[PDB]
Amino acid sequence: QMKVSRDSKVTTVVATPGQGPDRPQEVSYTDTKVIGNGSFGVVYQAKLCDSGELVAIKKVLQDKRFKNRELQIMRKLDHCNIVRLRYFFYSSGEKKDEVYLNLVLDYVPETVYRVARHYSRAKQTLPVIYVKLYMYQLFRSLAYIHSFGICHRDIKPQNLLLDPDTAVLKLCDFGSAKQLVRGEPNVSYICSRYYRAPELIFGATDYTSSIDVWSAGCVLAELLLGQPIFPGDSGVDQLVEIIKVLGTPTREQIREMNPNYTEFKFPQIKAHPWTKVFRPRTPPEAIALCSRLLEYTPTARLTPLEACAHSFFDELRDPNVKLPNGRDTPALFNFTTQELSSNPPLATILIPPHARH
């Protein structure tokens, strides 16, 4: 479809709204410029003509060789820590005759990665209140997508959008996400380096949603250290880094990750205590949280909802907590029945008494 006009160049398409039944409407935008780039996405910024609001437009080739679940997964998602899909449409694009999907998302200016990179260049540590706020909101988005059976499979600091004025975090980049069905196998070399769970590095095809929890544990540890905790160009390199921290996995832990490795005689490396991994001033509660996330056995990792109930986030449940810029914290306690379905009795902890209003 598409068309050009003048207001600045105005683009008009017939786009389908992200929510509700399929009822496309004319949508006009202007002020187009290329902003972000990923391994698959090419994100434009634009300004909607009606409301003046800023949006991001991820334009992705619709490769029919691969499973393109991204639109179908995003359409069912509505949560305050997941970037909203306002509209989508199809356009002819640039590759002669080819099919390009356009996702019109809420525009969010920063990522956890770019914020953490400022502190590393300045040799400061990200203040712990932000580690708490950012990690808490991440786990809350994971509890939401996992309650639908959906695994993100690309959790990493570049995929976490921040509005740093409000400290609101939004998960994005669902182009690797999948609805994991037990008994059906999954492609194994998924997730980005530094954030791959050990069962994935061992080539497991029968993994679960808890790979996202391992990835979240790597983000947390990175935020606390100021650099990735398991760097490495290859799978062996990263597994060495994991083993130099957690120790050599037992035979039973190897069986939980991938039974095809249980008969090899790996050298037994002693674990490095978590208190020595991190800086001497690191809060003990963050270390305890990190050690219950970065676990070899996938069923022994915290679920995302259980992570939100952790004592590390206790300061967020104070009525008197304020952000460093003076504004109050974002909404943290408006849990639905859907995202509590994992374990409903955690509402006793997760909604503190001053927020039942």
Next chain:
Amino acid sequence: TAPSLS
């Protein structure tokens, strides 16, 4: 990092 074959 990429999704599954169809």
Next chain:
Amino acid sequence: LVEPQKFAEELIHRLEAVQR
């Protein structure tokens, strides 16, 4: 994927070198 024999051989060789 990767053959489990070849991956484990590489990992074993790496783990022997860092073993304190």
